Design a binder for this molecule. Structure first.
Ligand SMILES: [Zn+2]
Lengths: 83, 65, 149, 101, 145
RNA sequence: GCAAGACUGCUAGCCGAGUAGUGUUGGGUCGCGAAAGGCCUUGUGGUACUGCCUGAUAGGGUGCUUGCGAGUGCCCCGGGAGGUCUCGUA
RNA sequence: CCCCCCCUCCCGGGAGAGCCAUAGUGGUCUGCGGAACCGGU
RNA sequence: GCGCAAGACGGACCAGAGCGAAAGCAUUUGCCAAGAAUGUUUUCAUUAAUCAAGAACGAAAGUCGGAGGUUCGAAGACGAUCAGAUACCGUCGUAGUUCCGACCAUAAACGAUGCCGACCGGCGAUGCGGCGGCGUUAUUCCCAUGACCCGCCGGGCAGCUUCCGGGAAACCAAAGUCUUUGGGUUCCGGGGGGAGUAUGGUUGCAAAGCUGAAACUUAAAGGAAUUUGGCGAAGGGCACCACC
């Protein structure tokens, strides 16, 4: 309360707060690397795609537009790519 | 009334203590959460303590509305 | 809050701190610009071009793969639209509201919304006039809707 | 001076509510201010219950219940002794009256 | 419809529910869903079936209101309308009256609405007979055994 | 290729067999389910219940006993005995 | 002598998709290693 | 009891719940257009807040022209209460109550509190969108979705407590961060009557709407809260000078 440490907040506190209320503005979104057992070529998609995407190779519809994230088609593996 | 004799028989009962400890029981019923808490303070496993099954069912807080 | 509605909101983008292209993105600048040119030739606007590039091609945003923004690139090549996208959308919305109002004369709320939309159009056109992108004699007129589609 | 934190009703973000009619009176009053009373009552109380029960065509029968809702204006609600005045700090208590009968 | 002698013959004309039951079914902290369908049987017996449904509270639910979204209510009403119009046009009145003796239509609607919002009771609270065909004697004498 | 652990479903002989059929809201590699017959080692032990309906001894409905509140009791067949089952009171 | 009964108590047996130990058994997960890397079809 | 015709209307579900700038908004379905919030690693880059002139909407009553007039009901007719009622009450009952136009622009149009923006305590609920996680259910297995539960995030109507603070107090997380007085910008108050009157302008067929004094007169008029006063207010106690 009176004596906190706003310079070095714990990660739990920082992740609790809103994205624009943190000590530094950092989005909570991320990119994905989605692929399916059917086709054997891998694409890169955004978490909140908000747009229907067709796999390059006309395999099937991969993502689905929703309010938040994207409803990944069943039978697909994805990993969180980061630098 | 502030009594100093304090009900002689009940005062003796207060003086009476049992031969058993009533606390140093050989079996302790604790959830895994308490075991995880204890594992990270200074010490680890014990020889007079065992973990119980997770008592989480549906929820607490019976319906009132 | 909102300029016209009395509602307060907080929902928009939040760019990351690190201003560097990610290493997993193998795309160069030339091919990104080529894709931008192709999408522009297809008949889209910079509002959706960035969306398509950040969804399918995996690029975060243009301002890091290249230096010029999307509208800057379109102006550089020359196939950029003559009228701003937001002003075009506002004009189209005003035309739609007026077309709805021609038949139903008792919809007072539609009249109020049309007044608000025309106010927004005037306020944006004033900024365009003072920033030297539209001719000084350009005026928004109620009847002129067919030409400005 | 202002007596209640609210305005004697429950309208906080509406500005208008449907007007209803009193039952004892004919006064037209706002819905959220008009005291609403819901009563559960049987056809017979304690006199004709036996006469219906033992003297009946069918056996093992449950008596029907008459259902009705009441709307009372403030003057009509107080004149019929449905609600009564309370103390200054006792008016802030929103708990319903005890029910055990 | 006809009397032979010292013995009158009848026919189905409608069905209603007890007013006390209907009063007791409509309670607080629940949404009532209504739907009227004007569907004709195989023969020219046009009926206007009505429906009533309510939502209730789960055994572990804490929310006292337990309301429903407007779109969920619309979907439930569409389901009830389709269920009633499906079990009328395919059969005559003579045995759908027998079907009406139990709450088979009500049970079907209740089972069909488990996915949108769980309702407890489905009742055809009123059935009216709007139109009837040309008067016939053979059907009448077949109705009475 | 080394390699031991943690857990799970069904059968309480195995085979045919998760065959027919039932089935659900959107799907699926699916819930539900004894065999006809055969081949034989020829078919595991302790443990309490069971109001009515729907669709398990699960889940969801809904009771009977004294006005009322808590009990005991409420699947079936075979023996014996008895006849107002227990505590408080709008 | 009444009844038809209905209920309660002391025992035996039948049915179930209860639980627990043993067999017929089917899969999920975890540890180590591939003499060392960079590109072209 | 069975059928027919006409008009108004949308009970119970209905909540200190929702939407709309305000007035205001409820039977199912179909069509058209719009909006707040949540999500966003999309787009432009100061396009911003409040506002003299001006402009749209604006409850019921109010007027003008058509169609309908079921019910309620100004004026009016009648009967009783009453000393006196052309008041309370009861029966009829025109204009209006309904719709399509043409007008007025008025309320206790009240949160009696202007808008934008920053900050300073806590605690549970509710409605929306997003997010994480055991477990039941759409019968028993696999996933997505509804329903249930445990949290978190943002905006919105509100709730409870307190020596943050303030006020004359009633009370207020704003009616606070104000003599230790300066965030930005509009309207408006100067003791009580006369008086929102006369007048002049102005809009309206009219009713009336906006702007709006002076002469004379008074030392009071007013806001909050206690003890007795009285109630044709509620709720308790006692008495054979009260009763059974
Ligand atoms: Zn009244």
């Amino acid at each position: 309360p009176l004596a906190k440490d706003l310079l070095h907040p714990s990660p739990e506190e920082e992740k609790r707060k809103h994205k624009k209320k943190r000590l530094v503005q950092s989005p909570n979104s991320y990119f994905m690397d989605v692929k399916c057992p059917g086709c054997y070529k891998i694409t890169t998609v955004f978490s909140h795609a908000q747009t229907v995407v067709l796999c390059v190779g006309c395999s099937t519809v991969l993502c689905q537009p929703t309010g938040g994230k994207a409803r990944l088609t069943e039978g697909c593996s994805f990993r969180r790519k980061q630098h | 009334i502030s009594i100093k004799l304090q009900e002689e028989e009940r005062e003796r009962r207060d003086n009476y203590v049992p031969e058993v400890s009533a606390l140093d029981q050989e079996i302790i019923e604790v959830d895994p959460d308490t075991k995880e808490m204890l594992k990270l303070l200074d010490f680890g496993s014990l020889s007079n303590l065992q973990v119980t099954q997770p008592t989480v069912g549906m929820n607490f807080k019976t319906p009132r509305g | 809050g909102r300029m016209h509605a009395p509602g307060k909101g907080l929902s928009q983008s939040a760019l990351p701190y690190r201003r560097s292209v990610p290493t997993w993105l193998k795309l160069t600048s030339d091919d990104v610009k080529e894709q931008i040119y192709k999408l522009a030739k297809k008949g889209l606007t910079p509002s959706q071009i960035g969306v398509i590039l950040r969804d399918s091609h995996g690029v975060a945003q243009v301002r890091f793969v290249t230096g010029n923004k999307i509208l800057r690139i379109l102006k550089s090549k020359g196939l950029a639209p003559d009228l701003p996208e937001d002003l075009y959308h506002l004009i189209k919305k005003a035309v739609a509201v007026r077309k709805h109002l021609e038949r139903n004369r008792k919809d007072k709320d539609a009249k109020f919304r049309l007044i608000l939309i025309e106010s927004r159009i005037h306020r944006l056109a004033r900024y365009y006039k003072t920033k030297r992108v539209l001719p000084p004699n350009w005026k928004y007129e109620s009847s002129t809707a067919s030409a400005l589609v | 001076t202002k007596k209640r934190r609210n305005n004697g009703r429950a309208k906080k973000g509406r500005g208008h509510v449907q007007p209803i009619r009193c039952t004892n009176c004919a006064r037209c009053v706002p819905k959220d201010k008009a005291i609403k009373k819901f009563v559960i009552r049987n056809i017979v109380e304690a006199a004709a219950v036996r006469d219906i029960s033992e003297a009946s065509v069918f056996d093992a029968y449950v008596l029907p219940k008459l259902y009705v809702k009441l709307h009372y204006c403030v003057s009509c609600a107080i004149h019929s002794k449905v609600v009564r005045n309370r103390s200054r700090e006792a008016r802030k208590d929103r708990t319903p009256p005890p029910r055990f009968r | 419809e006809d009397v032979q002698g010292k013995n009158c013959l009848t026919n189905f004309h409608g069905m209603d529910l007890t007013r006390d039951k209907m009063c007791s079914m409509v309670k607080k902290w629940q949404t009532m869903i209504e739907a009227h369908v004007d569907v004709k049987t195989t023969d020219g017996y046009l009926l206007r079936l009505f429906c009533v449904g309510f939502t209730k509270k789960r055994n572990n639910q804490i929310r006292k209101t337990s309301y429903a979204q407007h779109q969920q209510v619309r979907q439930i009403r569409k389901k009830m309308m389709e269920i009633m119009t499906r079990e009328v046009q395919t059969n005559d009145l003579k045995e759908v009256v027998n079907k009406l003796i139990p709450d088979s239509i009500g049970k079907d609607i209740e089972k069909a609405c488990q996915s949108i919002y769980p309702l407890h009771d489905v009742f055809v609270r009123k059935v009216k007979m709007l139109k009837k065909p040309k008067f016939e004697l053979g059907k009448l004498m077949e109705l009475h055994g």
